Amino acid sequence: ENLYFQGGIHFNCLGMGNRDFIEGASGATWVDLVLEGDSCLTIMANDKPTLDVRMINIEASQLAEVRSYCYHASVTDISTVARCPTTGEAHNEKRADSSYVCKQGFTDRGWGNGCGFFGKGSIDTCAKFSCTSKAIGRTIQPENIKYKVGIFVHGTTTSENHGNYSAQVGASQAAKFTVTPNAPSVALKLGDYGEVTLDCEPRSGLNTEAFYVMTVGSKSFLVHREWFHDLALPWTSPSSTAWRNRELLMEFEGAHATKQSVVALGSQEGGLHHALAGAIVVEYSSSVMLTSGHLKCRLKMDKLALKGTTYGMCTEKFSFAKNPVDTGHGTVVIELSYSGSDGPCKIPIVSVASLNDMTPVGRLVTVNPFVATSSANSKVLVEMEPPFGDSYIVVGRGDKQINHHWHKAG
């Protein structure tokens, strides 16, 4: 696919409002995760590159109609047949046309309006019903659900490309894969970092017998099933193609002598949206429905390796392309510019408590940061967790070395 000319996706964590950090046991082969749809996980493990994993969305396909409800009807071609008192029931011939809704009644008759006898004359009034606009309720089967999950390895990035999916796939540093009930475990390679396996239990986060997907006009919703069954609207189903309870959208008004008007209610769409005010909204424009939720998984990392743990250290001078800023997640991010051209090469960077005391404090989130190109003045983003209080970010070695002060409150 041409990702370079497709829309971006949220596939990693920096900049997102909701972010959780996960620390995997040192040496452990697996880490247990719950992907929540509005959030993002950063996974850090000793001797492992750092990962972002996040659910992108949940898709359902091939949904089956259960019932359709008319919410806006047209009512046309009204007629009334009437009879005199004592002559029995009126029968309008449109009773033979399944498209018509008919109702019997009575009107006052006498000499004055054409009857030899005084009393109640039978009338029968029919009108053609058609559905102008209908809402549709559908079921999802679990086999037709797909979870799209993004993964990102904290390799070399820049402030410009860090969140760009086509750039990180280009760098072999991101990927997007699909777990389903029938295929709930997936292995993918991550460039020079080996592979991971996502071993998930999709069925545990599914409740497809609890709801219907209901489309109303331009919106679709997840609705409680019994609420859907008791809607007071005309309906059809696959096993019952003709509209039943069509009178619900019709008003047979007061009859006089031999005439009676029948009108349609206005659209019931707005009433429906009102009733659905607090219901889950889902995207259901195409044949595919998109929603969000939870997915429990185990992330396997025994085949996940460090990359370039054998490059040489960068030898030339760095500078701060962007001075450190708090990410809002308890971490600090910088962007470095590297003047050298021996790249790719490892960035010497540490937090120390003072320049007297060059003892490493804190730690990197972008573990093993590296310049990835021989181009001079390239950029590398580095995310880190300094300690509380005063420390200095120290980049490079010797007298090439630069530092920036930082203070973390608390």
Author numbering: -9 to 400
Authors' text:
Studies have demonstrated that E protein is the most important protein determing the virulence of JEV. To address this open question we determined the X-ray structures of the E protein ectodomains of JEV SA14-14-2 and of its parent virulent SA14 virus in a monomeric state and reliably modeled dimers (assembled to 180-mers) and trimers mostly present during the viral life cycle. The structures of JEV SA14 and SA14-14-2 E protein are highly similar to those of other flaviviruses. Architecturally, all of them consist of three domains, Domain I (DI, yellow), Domain II (DII, red) and Domain III (DIII, dark blue).
The overall crystal structures of JEV SA14 and SA14-14-2 E proteins were determined at a resolution of 2.2 Å and 2.1 Å, respectively, by molecular replacement methods. The rotation angle between JEV SA14 and SA14-14-2 DII relative to the superimposed DIII was 12.5° resulting in a distance between the two Gly102 (b and c) of 21.9 Å. Notably, JEV SA14-14-2 Met279 superimposes with JEV SA14 Val280 which implicates a shortcut of segment 280–283 and a prolongation of the preceding β hairpin 274–279. While Glu138Lys change is the key event to shift Glu49 to Lys138 in JEV SA14-14-2 E protein and thus induce the inversion of the side chain direction of residue 279 from the bulk solvent to the hydrophobic protein interior accompanied by a rotation of the preceding β hairpin 274–279 towards DIII which pulls the entire DII with it. We speculated the aromatic side chain of Phe107 in JE attenuated virus SA14-14-2 E protein might cause some steric hindrance, such that the invasion of Trp101 of JE attenuated virus SA14-14-2 E protein into the membrane is hampered compared to JE virulent virus SA14 thereby causing virulence attenuation. The lower fusion activity of JE attenuated virus SA14-14-2 is compatible with its unfavorable trimer geometry and its reduced dimer dissociation capability because of the fixation of the DII to DI + DIII angle in JEV SA14-14-2 monomers due to the mutation of residues 107, 138 and 279.
